[model samples]
Target chain A: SETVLDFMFNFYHQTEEHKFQEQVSKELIGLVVLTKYNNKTYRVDDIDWDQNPKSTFKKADGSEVSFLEYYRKQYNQEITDLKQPVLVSQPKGPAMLIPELCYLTGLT
Target chain B: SETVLDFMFNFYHQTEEHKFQEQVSKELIGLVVLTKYNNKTYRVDDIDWDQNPKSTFKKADGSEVSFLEYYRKQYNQEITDLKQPVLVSQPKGPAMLIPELCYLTGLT
Candidate 1:
């Protein structure tokens, strides 16, 4: 008897508005990703599917800013979708990331 | 009816042979930690309770080394316990850490 292996489909972000050509794969849980904004890599620990770009977080300067504005001010890139859920990358600390701004680094 | 909160005890490494002067807390999962060997901070993604200092991994130079030997040669500190499990911290990439050489950072 032959056995079939289970296959799972991986989703990739398809957009050309950003300069980063690497596609952000949705199967990034426990995978390392490189962010175009800071040119640094981070490991995706979790994905907050309920929270979107409209969600706000406190910065080191004790100021609250939404993911939409933070990306524009910090990286000069405007987020096209305000409803896409954020990726949780915790290196030094917990950070929210936009899937479109992250690229797969081929590391797990 | 009345309700009571459950309490769990946190374990801390108690030793004086090292110069870090910081206790390695076992409750470091999902918490940020500072390594005395490099003075850099990393968030603990998970703890490999089954693996210890004797576990080996490959480095960038394509050399295989155990957690015990890596600490001894790279950091000049010998691991006192070979049975203590290692900590998995991934920032730019996945890294195995020695708990005794890591100190708790005040960030979650």
Candidate 2:
């Protein structure tokens, strides 16, 4: 429900939101920015969500995991529980926001 | 099946999945590299899907010649159709997931 555009600033900031929210909820897997132009993103440019992630991981979440012990514990699912396998399926709605689209668009 | 992590290293990876899956079927589109270190996804770096989105113009689909906005309208009606409308009537599978505790997890 979020986006991953071809804009640099937006990319890193967005994921910060993603990771932070995993402990809480913030609408969308999180949004990020990407720029097909640079071919790379820098952490120094983050502003929207993190000032210093390592020092601010838990702080990003508005509420905190109120339940889990640590973040990884949540992802610790049984292989069998990993049911939503990303198989040989075509794309869906979520895919609409990638920066590479610029290339396919010939902007690259 | 790419990912947008939060760690400085992983954060930058954008591993670059979802959006990539969204290019006119860009073969997963390109990936990215950044860090929630500051937080935010520096989609600055990206790697690779496909879809039938707004780019790539046309893929030579037999019937595409006449389809304007060729891909936009072609969204997964199939997927949408397959979805059993969560009439709320109650919360179901996908609904079980959400970042926010939702204070009311149902529909708020």
Candidate 3:
């Protein structure tokens, strides 16, 4: 009835939306941005939906900086976390694809 | 015999590695960086593997550029491509997770 992809899409659209909306629906909800401020390593949280790439935070020398600034000035790197495991499969569409292809291309 | 995630991991580690090492093995190989050159919208490909976040591109006024520079300057935004359909599933481990938890926490 459903391929894994289908299940995922359906899950996001139906199940996740039914609950927490996008956060639960989208795959990556959080990230760790590696940065440097005042010549020290800063591992900051890159929260997109929160619109706080660097959001608002204090630096070593006591300056208010945006994640955007830090990202440009001293962005070392970033990586994903296991807040929720990244999914591994996608729906093997049609079921809709083949039918749609035949309908559109006249190759059947 | 493996969960989709397991199959994916195994596939990446084995089949994908057997093919192109990291590119084919990693999920996201490329991205599109939207930039502004002379106030004109430029859809630049954010080729990470190529090491050009803004890697070596020409600007509107005909100036050499780097993705990083463009990213920092205009710092517009980016998006993903369907080059390879972003997979929709992930491996379901151990089923080794529970075992590891028990071993570490001694709850068994």
Candidate 4:
């Protein structure tokens, strides 16, 4: 008697992810980059929220790659990201118009 | 007859924004420390476009502020947050790596 292993592809869509960076794999392959380190940098093929914090960085081994160095790197720097201008400034601090800047902006 | 404008505000469950930072923001802020350019120090005020060739800086006054030189005045290293130690034996040349980073948040 031959036994068959039935696999369903429909279960694949059950993931919580709605998006993933496409060309990124093209740009950051051999180079060591960090996820969560950059707002956008590295991502796996299919994301599984089942994992609290997914792969921080995809390694050359096809395994997840992340270094505590990202924190030190962040600690070494005051701010992160080159965001758009806010036209408002005060003091000699980083360009933070406000904290927890929670607002929905619409693009024309 | 007077017609009334209808308005509705419903409170949905937690969006499980498990995808907020997953939400990207353009132009990370970073201080252009002279020749040494750190991505996060300078803040760009404007330049919101999906084009990868966009500017990563947004000065409120539209002025470029390089912290490399500015940091000398304060003398405190710009790195203030706790970050993972970023390690790469041979960097891909400032231009070689990180012109931009894209995230996976259903971002178009």
Worst 10 residues of 1 chain A by lDDT: A1-10
Local accuracy of candidate 1 as per-residue lDDT tens digits, A1-108: 000000011232222423111333235577776775687878877777678778999999999999888988988755544445688877645988876566565686
**Over the stretch A18-106, how does candidate 4's per-residue lDDT look in tens digits?**
32112222222223212222343221122122221111444456764322223335433221221111111233221112110111122
True contacts kept of each: 0.00, 0.04, 0.00, 0.00
lDDT tens readout by residue for model 3, B18-100: 34335433432221111122232222112123331323566779997654455446643221111112221123210001100
- For every model in order, the TM-score on chain A comes to 0.72, 0.16, 0.30, 0.17
Model 2, residue A48: distance off in Å is 4.3
RMSD of each: 20.2, 19.4, 23.2, 21.7
Largest DockQ belongs to which candidate? Answer: 2
Q: Across residues B7-52, which tens digit of lDDT does each residue of candidate 2 receive?
A: 1223233336454233312321122322211232222212211211
Distance (Å) between predicted and true CA of B14, model 2? 15
Q: Distance (Å) between predicted and true CA of B50, model 3?
A: 4.8
Q: Which of candidates 3 and 4 is the stronger one according to lDDT?
A: 3
Better of 2 and 4 by DockQ: 2
Residues B59-87 of candidate 1: C-alpha lDDT, one tens digit per residue: 99999998878878988755544445677
| Local lDDT at B47 for model 1 | 69
- Each candidate's DockQ score against the native complex? 0.01, 0.04, 0.02, 0.01
Q: Can you give the lDDT of residue A62 in candidate 4?
A: 70
Chain B of candidate 2 vs. true chain B, TM: 0.17
User: Mind giving the per-residue lDDT tens digits that candidate 2 earns over A1-108?
Assistant: 221221232333344645743422232223233323334322111123321111212324564431112223543311111111111112321212222211211111
- For model 4 chain A, give the 10-residue run with minimal summed lDDT: A1-10
